[PDB]
């Protein structure tokens, strides 16, 4: 359901690893269920520490 919505948001009719990764890691509970799991070709959530940005 969630990965499908991630595919719909990227104008793709096909779910790919990234779409599953984005579904799982933006949802609190799934993320926790699969905390110790790596999703192949999943990548990471766009996230830059605040002190690293410019002013």
């Amino acid at each position: 359901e969630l990965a499908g919505n991630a595919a719909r948001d990227n104008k793709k009719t096909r779910i790919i690893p990234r779409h599953l990764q984005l579904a799982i890691r933006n949802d609190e509970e799934l993320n926790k269920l699969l905390g110790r799991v790596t999703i192949a070709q999943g990548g990471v959530l766009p996230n830059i520490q605040a002190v690293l940005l410019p002013k």
């Binding site: 690893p17 192949a40 690293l52």
Partner: protein, 99 residues
């Protein structure tokens, strides 16, 4: 008028780029030869399904990326923006990887 970006600006572009992508970031062949090299030390004349070496890379890259996230916080925690070997060492100490 030669254009120049300040130190940190391209780094910040690279972060943004690489976070958005999912493609493996180590060159595959040098990696494959390293897997084969280390595998010798346990058993000689070992063959590898291509998918086996790909698993190992997918694995190696996720773990290291993850470790960099934890390392990065250790640097920031010490009022720095530059990661250093001691940051990696604290991280792995707290993770329970090393003593």
């Amino acid at each position: 008028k030669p254009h120049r970006y300040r130190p940190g600006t391209v780094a910040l572009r690279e972060i943004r780029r690489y976070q958005k992508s999912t493609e493996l970031l180590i060159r595959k062949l040098p990696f494959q030869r390293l897997v084969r090299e280390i595998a010798q030390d346990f058993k000689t004349d070992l063959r590898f399904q291509s998918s086996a070496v790909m698993a190992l890379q997918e694995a190696c890259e996720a773990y290291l990326v993850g470790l960099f996230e934890d390392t990065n916080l250790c640097a920031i925690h010490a009022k720095r923006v530059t990661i250093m070997p001691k940051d990696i060492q604290l991280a792995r100490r707290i993770r329970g990887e090393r003593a």
